[PDB]
Design a protein around this nucleic acid. Structure first.
Lengths: 716, 249, 735, 94
RNA sequence: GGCCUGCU
RNA sequence: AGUAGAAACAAGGCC
């Protein structure tokens, strides 16, 4: 039958009908009479629509061939011959522009004169039944319907026929051409009734070929095919198989509970080796401040001018000389770098306006100090294979180092009060609710407690230094840059003040990965002699740069004044995390506020004021040789803030591992102290897990010592 | 006019012609998401790192013909170098602030009508009345509650057809909404937003947010009302209760 | 006196101050170089935990595979992957018996979803291993490349737009003699059957960074695109199953997890009378993923899908069949340094099979020597067990089956147990009349776990009396206690954009106040610090200050120009009006009534060249990877302002041979923008159909010109011009 | 079609051991002088569990029954069976 | 010396 | 040298 559509109809219509065939997903080889019927429907749609044009009037202009002009409007514009999505697109667009009603089924054409749709259907059966059939299929329709049938008859409601009658003679001539051409073909044994509305399909997902063999190799050891295994599974029913293997399984497979008593836990062993060194990016306990007493705010001002003005406030400069060498570098380079920094600072002082940011010369001194041109050149393996020295990067456990007493004193003095306010908080919306007033009062109390704390000063120092370093690295990637360490505080009298700890020289910072390292050299003034705790300054070079006179009742001290100079490095991640050190304030004060709220849930009243003023209640916050010492809530605030600050400063994988594996043991010990009969399956394994995190970090070793002390004081 | 004209210009060049011809409508989404740009793992680190560069943000090419290349002192506002995989050009953040001090101005009177949820929140809070804070242990029990206080009793898909018919009346397809509540919602949000020119996509998104009901599991103590859950952070705490009555009531 | 914070625990219980034990204020550990060492170590460890299995050689991939299932029962407490098929089938049968109708229903909904799912659902995924280029690429890019290659090779069933048809094409590709791929350096290369099989069965290995809570780094894996559809269907089934199990806690959030934990502890302890003792085990499973054999997941799913259409069973079984034969790419490689000659070199991992061992240290030398026998075409066969939690939900199902197997109806003894399982972590409440009963119950639970290939970490687990325990960093002590140290890293600028960052910060403060019991004063301090960091990050200072920045001039002139300066946004150098009462309001709407109409109009102008919206999914959704958890998405309330710009892209593609991808990106985006202008609903609802672009665009041009004349700007001249231009593009597409 | 021959029976001490062997799923069954058949093991009964182990070599075409810690109440003819096919049995006397 | 890139 | 820690950075590539 398909030979007929090969022969007669034009290409355009046959591929339109083929795409309509693909539309609903049925195959053309099984039933083709539908293809012919609907392609004839589509053909009558065209032949009825084309050759029919309109101009600004009604009364369509009919031309056998559209002449070249703007007057190519089509009388009837076709609906079908398009995908369902576009057919409904045209339906909705016509409804929204023509203000007509939206039909629920697919029309075939639209006309302007009568401003409505045409649903053309030419069926094998006579018209006077198919018409009202499709009419009762369509609900309350104003779209006019018109149908032909092979006998040659026409019909329509309203007795309406919308265009010329010679066109309809055309239609029925086409119709009988179709008819008495099948006459030569002979199809009416099924042509009248060939489609009955079949819609059914079964989804087929068949495993075959290579993928089947893979299925045959992904079974238990004693199975040969997926078919057999699935049959076995379907036939499988529970018949007490877990019990049999449990009985047969060796009894050494057990989870015996070892009781956890007061005498069970042993102190954590600390590693032994050379004392632990300093790792901070700046001096914490041994910092010195040169000040100007200016009225500018933290960010307000220009760095270089402030630094120069602060440094001019000090008199007593001496020619620098080596006091304590780096022990691994070239100290003369550090000396020359310091003198170069001074010289270029003067050079800025001379000229017209202090630059906002200064670049330094790339001398051999800072070329060595900043580690320039030291990365091995990257080459290909095929060119370097016979080199005996060629091997992997050194990948082994870090060097072992024992704890020293300097970190303990540094933390002790990091929780001490100061003679300045190191936090100038921002603005918030004016409090409107009583709860907001309570929150503001609490916040004011904590700010009064923590602002005068060395932890806040360290927070500001780190934030400013890391912000400046990151910005300089991102801006001046190539050229070495000078950045004075600046921090602005407020005195007890209320006068604002600036403080200059020293200088940082940032080097080449072409940082691609988050782990890539930018090297800088840090110089900081101090008065602490490095000849008393040399092991804490393994990586520092310390010079003697001047003498300071601070008013004291013992005449006047006239102390020496040294310069701690070192080469340090950071990374994008480290800079970003060090510039978010202000969340240590959060951590600490959230803990304290949780304490206050928990206690106030007992007594139905806010308990902040008496906690902060009466200072009756105290918490164990340290141990003295006499015994455990307790301090007021403010001291707890400062201690927790210092702990968070040191966590942010000495952060490392060792800290995370020890924190987790020691929190586990802390929970076990707490369960013991709560009389909850705690038990363990392998306590030695937990101890070994904790002890492997303690390698060389001073902070984690101090935490381990604190944990041992807590165990000793606990378990009683 | 224009649209078909850049269509013809695209089809003029062979590669885009092939892309238009062989690519089917269904694959639309795929090729639209086809990109070499990986999704950032650490957005904060790079936002703090990119903002230290010059020309850290991106803007459409049209910026080159509305904002001058430099400001009064000569600080550059935009660059003509296009982004990696787009025709947009990289520009400095000042071009933002510049646009807020001398850029073109319009009538933003209809934004309150579009962003109905946020302005309703503001109105509800502005007329609220606070009360005394009572300090006592709160037994916070976890419950499933509806957070959206303006949901019109419609699901995501249920209101999606409404949203299309309100914004994209022609792409609705087969669906013609039966429920009369949807009829009235369509009528109201059609006559209300008849000429709003913010964007079809944002209008649809905000209509989805407003009409679609959404639910989440939260620790609550008292309240349980939609209007009382948006301020759950302000009325309920660990050891304190703050009596509150939104402006709606 | 020496200060010691830990001594604070002598007065404050450990859980009431547990936040102090979370050093989440410093930089988390990161990996620096290759992850090849970790990948090799994981492969060797997975293979040696199942050493007593039986060896075979796959006839298709030619790789050695180790099957330990039904192997000898363990005789020691060391990890073992010798799961027994009959035991696990019996466990699943008991799970079904205790929950009748679970499998049949879940299979019904899964069948519905599978037969109505679309291909585009695969684009909604993070990095995936594209085999066309042998590298990780965004899910959409890899899917597009694979579809292009399939269409070039003759597999065009995916044009039906159905994920099931895409999987049919994927499987049909397995039986092809020779496929063709494209490489740029374009060159067409031919892949034989075995090479393509291994490229489709392989995984890409990387090192996990930003992982807090352990000293050593780990390795993670990413599969290809051929196997992700089957994984999606299997995980859909597993999620539908677990949603019907109250003992599971994987498909829920955190608060739901806490609620279920409280309910189970109350149920276990309350029902226990005075005579019965109760004990809670806070258990962690050692080597959870390395001991889960994909064959056992195949067994579980084929038991689940019993009495179901065979096509459903086949499509759900394809995934574990491929995992059982999965291969793993070793990794980036190894970098060597020579200090004598002062140079460095980078050898790819694919050379580990043949490269001499003189360059490697003792540990790496032994690892390579042990893993070499499993090396096939630069990748190692990893049949014995899963690599990194790809089947999280099925593992949770197995754990829930173990938990339910002690409902006192199967124990047949006075003791019994229950609890909650979330993959790699569990809490087990066991009750028994005497300590001997508790010991016997825990021993039998451990033994049954060892029969299913699941091991309990004795070093990271402990048992106490009920009332105090831990679960996924949630510490329960007669009621869950807030931590607030897990969410600390999320208190900074997110890094999306100005408005997005502001809204996300305020919303995070609000949420942590609601959930994590953040205090009022602490919340105010957090708001202040966040505002400070936000202003210092975006160079948007108050405007009344003299802080010179790259943006302080325009901000200052805008400040001096504005009359009501209280309405200026913090992004434009205005005061901050936020407070505890205003944390749930966007900044634009909070300052709407205070803004000057000129500034208000300039700010919220639709014609701004900065705002760009792509799809309904990416309107106000921000992907923030939370600390100590999987990547998560958040809805943030924000108004589309001129500050909603999107930041610059990487731009490093210009120096790589893969430079043509940018031109393809630009052309695809131009075509997509044209289509959207032709089809406005393209973004909100993704278009569907089987026609091509130009057909729809030209036909809609026809119709829209028509109707927009029937009322609108068009004119006959223009309408006819459009009609004949449509004809012109038609004949152009003809040729 | 399936012929079966048992081996490995005999006289043993109480508490001794004995490995029966019999040259499809398979079973071991026993018959005491005063009774009908009793289930032993298949590839175990309450009276023999833990004592006795059944195991097969499908390459040797043999099923084994490893009896340990024997009692006077094990005294029976032990028959091997295939599933319809029954051995003649091997005498075990404890 | 000149120019390109900074998660590809 | 320095940062850092089971492998890396201490710029890369292209002419």
């Amino acid at each position: 039958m398909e030979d007929f559509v090969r022969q007669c109809f034009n290409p355009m219509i046959v591929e339109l009908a083929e795409k309509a065939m693909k539309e609903y997903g049925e195959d053309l080889k099984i039933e083709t009479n539908k293809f012919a019927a609907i392609c004839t429907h589509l053909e009558v749609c065209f032949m009825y629509s084309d050759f029919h044009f309109i101009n600004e009037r009604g009364e369509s202009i009919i031309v056998e061939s559209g002449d070249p002009n703007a007057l190519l409007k089509h009388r009837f514009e076709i609906i079908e011959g398009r995908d369902r999505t576009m057919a409904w697109t045209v339906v909705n667009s016509i409804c929204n522009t023509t203000g007509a009603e939206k039909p629920k089924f697919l029309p075939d054409l639209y006309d302007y004169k009568e401003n409505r749709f045409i649903e053309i259907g030419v069926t094998r059966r006579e018209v006077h039944i198919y018409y009202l059939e499709k009419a009762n299929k369509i609900k309350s329709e104003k779209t006019h319907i018109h149908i032909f049938s092979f006998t040659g008859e026409e019909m329509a409601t309203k007795a309406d026929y919308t265009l010329d009658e010679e066109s309809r003679a055309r239609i029925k001539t086409r119709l009988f051409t179709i008819r008495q051409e099948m006459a030569s073909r002979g199809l009416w044994d099924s042509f009248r009734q060939s489609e009955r509305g079949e819609e059914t399909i079964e989804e087929r997902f068949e495993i075959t070929g290579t993928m089947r063999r893979l299925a045959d190799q992904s079974l238990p050891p004693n199975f040969s095919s997926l078919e057999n295994f699935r049959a076995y599974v379907d036939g499988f029913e529970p018949n007490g198989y877990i019990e049999g293997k449990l009985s047969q399984m060796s009894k050494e497979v057990n989870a015996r509970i070892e009781p956890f008593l007061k005498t069970t836990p042993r102190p954590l062993r600390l590693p032994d080796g050379p004392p632990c060194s300093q790792r901070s990016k700046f001096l914490l306990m041994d910092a010195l401040k040169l000040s100007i007493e200016d009225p500018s705010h933290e960010g307000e001002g220009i760095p270089l001018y402030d630094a120069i003005k602060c440094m001019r406030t000090f008199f007593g400069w001496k020619e620098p000389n080596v006091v304590k060498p780096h022990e691994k570098g070239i100290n003369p380079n550090y000396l020359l770098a310091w003198k170069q920094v001074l010289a270029e600072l003067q050079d800025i002082e001379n000229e017209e306006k202090i630059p906002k940011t200064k670049n330094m010369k790339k001398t051999s001194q800072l070329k060595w100090a900043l580690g320039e041109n030291m990365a091995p050149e990257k080459v290909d393996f095929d060119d370097c294979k016979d080199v005996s020295d060629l091997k992997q990067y050194d990948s082994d456990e870090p060097e072992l180092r024992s704890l020293a007493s300097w970190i303990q004193s540094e933390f002790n003095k990091a929780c001490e009060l100061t003679d300045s306010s190191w936090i100038e908080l921002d603005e918030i919306g004016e409090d409107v609710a009583p709860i907001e007033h309570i929150a503001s009062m609490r916040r004011n109390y904590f700010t009064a407690e923590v602002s005068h704390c060395r932890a806040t000063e360290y927070i500001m120092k780190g934030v400013y230094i890391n912000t400046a370093l990151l910005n300089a690295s991102c801006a001046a990637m190539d050229d070495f840059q000078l950045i004075p360490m600046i921090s602005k505080c407020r005195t007890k009298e209320g006068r604002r003040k600036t403080n200059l700890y020293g200088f940082i020289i940032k080097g080449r910072s072409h940082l691609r990965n988050d782990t890539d390292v930018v090297n800088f050299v840090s110089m900081e003034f101090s008065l602490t002699d490095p000849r008393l705790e040399p092991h804490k300054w393994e990586k520092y070079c310390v010079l003697e740069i001047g003498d300071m006179l601070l008013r004291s009742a013992i005449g006047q001290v006239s102390r020496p004044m040294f310069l701690y100079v070192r080469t340090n490095g950071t990374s994008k991640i480290k800079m970003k995390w060090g510039m978010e050190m202000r969340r240590c304030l959060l951590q600490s004060l959230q803990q304290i506020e949780s304490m206050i709220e928990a206690e106030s849930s007992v007594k139905e009243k806010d308990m902040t004021k008496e906690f902060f003023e009466n200072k009756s209640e105290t918490w164990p916050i340290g141990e003295s040789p006499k015994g455990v010492e307790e301090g007021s809530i403010g001291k707890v605030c400062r201690t927790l803030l210092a702990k968070s600050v040191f966590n942010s400063l000495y952060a490392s994988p060792q800290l995370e591992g020890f924190s987790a594996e020691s929190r586990k043991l802390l929970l076990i010990v707490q369960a013991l102290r709560d009389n909850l009969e705690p038990g363990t399956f392998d306590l030695g394994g937990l101890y070994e897990a904790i002890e492997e995190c303690l390698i060389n970090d001073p902070w984690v070793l101090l935490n381990a010592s604190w944990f041992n002390s807590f165990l000793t004081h606990a378990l009683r | 006019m224009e649209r078909i004209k850049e269509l013809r210009d695209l089809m003029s060049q062979s590669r885009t012609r092939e892309i238009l011809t062989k690519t089917t409508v269904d694959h639309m989404a795929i090729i639209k998401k086809y990109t070499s740009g990986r999704q950032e793992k650490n957005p904060a680190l790079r936002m703090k790192w990119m903002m230290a560069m010059k020309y850290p943000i991106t803007a459409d090419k049209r910026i080159m013909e509305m904002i001058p290349e430099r400001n009064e002192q000569g600080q550059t506002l935009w660059s003509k170098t296009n982004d990696a995989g787009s025709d947009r050009v990289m520009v400095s953040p000042l071009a933002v602030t510049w646009w807020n001090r001398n850029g073109p101005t319009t009538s933003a009177v209809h934004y309150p009508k579009i962003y109905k949820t946020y302005f309703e929140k503001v109105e509800r809070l502005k007329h609220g009345t606070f009360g005394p804070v009572h300090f006592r242990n709160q037994v916070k029990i976890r419950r499933r509650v509806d957070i959206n206080p303006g949901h019109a009793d419609l699901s995501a898909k249920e209101a999606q057809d409404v949203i299309m018919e309100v914004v994209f009346p022609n792409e609705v397809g087969a669906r013609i909404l039966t429920s009369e509540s949807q009829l009235t919602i369509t009528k109201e949000k059609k006559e209300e937003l008849q000429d709003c020119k913010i964007s079809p996509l944002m209008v649809a998104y905000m209509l989805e947010r407003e009409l679609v009901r959404k639910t989440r599991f939260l620790p609550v103590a008292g309240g349980t009302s939609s209007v009382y859950i948006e301020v759950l952070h302000l009325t309920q705490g660990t050891c304190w209760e703050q009596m509150y009555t939104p402006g709606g009531e | 006196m020496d200060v010691n914070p830990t001594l604070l625990f002598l007065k404050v219980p450990a859980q009431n101050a547990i936040s102090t034990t979370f050093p989440y204020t410093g930089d988390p550990p990161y990996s620096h170089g290759t992850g090849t060492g970790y990948t090799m170590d994981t492969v060797n460890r997975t293979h040696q935990y199942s050493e007593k299995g039986r060896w075979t050689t796959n006839t298709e991939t030619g790789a050695p595979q180790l099957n330990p299932i039904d192997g000898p029962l363990p005789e020691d407490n060391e990890p073992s992957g010798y799961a027994q098929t009959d035991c696990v089938l019996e466990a699943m049968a008991f799970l079904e018996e205790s929950h009748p109708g679970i499998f049949e229903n879940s299979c019904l909904e899964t069948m519905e979803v599978v037969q109505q799912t679309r291909v585009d659902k695969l684009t909604q995924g993070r990095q995936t291993y594209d085999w066309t280029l042998n590298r990780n690429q965004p899910a959409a890019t890899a899917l597009a490349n694979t579809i292009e290659v399939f269409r070039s090779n003759g597999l065009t069933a995916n044009e039906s737009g159905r994920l099931i048809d895409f999987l049919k094409d994927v499987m049909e590709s397995m039986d092809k003699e020779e496929m063709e791929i494209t490489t740029h350096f374009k060159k067409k290369q031919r892949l034989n059957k075995r090479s393509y099989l291994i490229r489709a069965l392989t995984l890409n290995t990387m090192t996990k960074d930003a992982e807090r809570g352990k000293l050593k780094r780990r390795a993670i894996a990413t599969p290809g695109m051929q196997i992700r559809g089957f994984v999606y269907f299997v995980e859909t089934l597993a999620r539908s199953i677990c949603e019907k199990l109250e003992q599971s806690g994987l498909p829920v959030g955190g608060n739901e997890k806490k609620a279920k934990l409280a309910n189970v502890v109350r149920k276990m302890m309350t029902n226990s009378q005075d005579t019965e003792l109760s004990f809670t085990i806070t258990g962690d499973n050692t080597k959870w993923n390395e001991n889960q054999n994909p064959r056992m997941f195949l067994a579980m799913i084929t038991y689940i899908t019993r009495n179901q259409p065979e096509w459903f069973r086949n499509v759900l079984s394809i995934a574990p069949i491929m995992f059982s034969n999965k291969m793993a790419r070793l990794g980036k490689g190894y970098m060597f340094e020579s200090k004598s000659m002062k140079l460095r070199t980078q050898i790819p991992a694919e050379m580990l099979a043949s490269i001499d061992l003189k360059y490697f240290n003792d540990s790496t030398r032994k690892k390579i020597e042990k893993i070499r026998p499993l090396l096939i075409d630069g990748t190692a066969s990893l049949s014995p067990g899963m690599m990194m939690g790809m089947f999280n939900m099925l593992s949770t199902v197995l754990g829930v089956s173990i938990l339910n197997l002690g409902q006192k109806r199967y124990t047949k003894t006075t003791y019994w147990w229950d609890g909650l399982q979330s993959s790699d972590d569990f809490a087990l409440i066991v009750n028994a009349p005497n300590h001997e009963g508790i010991q016997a119950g825990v021993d039998r639970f451990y033994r049954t776990c060892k029969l299913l290939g699941i091991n309990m970490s004795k070093k990271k687990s402990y048992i106490n009396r009920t009332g105090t325990f831990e679960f996924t960093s949630f510490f329960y002590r007669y009621g869950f206690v807030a931590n607030f140290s897990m969410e600390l890293p999320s208190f900074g600028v997110s890094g999306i954009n100005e408005s997005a960052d502001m809204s996300i910060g305020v919303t995070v403060i609000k949420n942590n106040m609601i959930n994590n019991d953040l205090g009022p004063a602490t919340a105010q301090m957090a708001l202040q610090l966040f505002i400070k960091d936000y202003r210092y990050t975006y160079r948007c200072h108050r405007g009344d200050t003299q802080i010179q920045t790259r943006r302080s001039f325009e901000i200052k002139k805008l400040w001096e120009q504005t009359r009501s300066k209280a309405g200026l946004l913090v992004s434009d150098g205005g005061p901050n009006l936020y407070n505890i009462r205003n944390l749930h309001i966007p900044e634009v709407c909070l300052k709407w009534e205070l803004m000057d109409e000129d500034y208000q109009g300039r700010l919220c102008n639709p014609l701004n060249p900065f705002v760009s919206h792509k799809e309904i999914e990416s309107v106000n959704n921000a992907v923030m990877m939370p600390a100590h958890g999987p990547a998560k998405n958040m809805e943030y309330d924000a108004v589309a302002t001129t500050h909603s710009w999107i930041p610059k892209r990487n731009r490093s593609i210009l120096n790589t041979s893969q430079r043509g991808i940018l031109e393809d990106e630009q052309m695809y985006q131009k075509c997509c923008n044209l289509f959207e202008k032709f089809f406005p609903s393209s973004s909100y609802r993704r278009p569907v159909g089987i026609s091509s672009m130009v057909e729809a665009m030209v036909s809609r041009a026809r119709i829209d010109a028509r109707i927009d004349f029937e009322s609108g700007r068009i004119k006959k001249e223009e309408f006819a011009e459009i009609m004949k231009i449509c004809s012109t593009i038609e004949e152009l597409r003809r040729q | 079609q399936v012929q079966l021959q048992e081996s490995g029976g005999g006289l043993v001490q109480a508490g001794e051991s004995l490995r029966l062997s019999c040259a499809y799923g398979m079973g071991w069954f026993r018959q005491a002088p005063g009774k009908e058949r009793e289930f032993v093991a298949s590839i175990a009964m309450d009276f023999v569990k833990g004592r006795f182990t059944i195991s097969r070599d499908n390459s040797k075409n043999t099923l084994y029954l490893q009896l340990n810690t024997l009692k006077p109440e094990d005294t029976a003819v032990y028959y091997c069976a295939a599933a319809k096919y029954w051995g003649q049995g091997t005498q075990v006397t404890v």
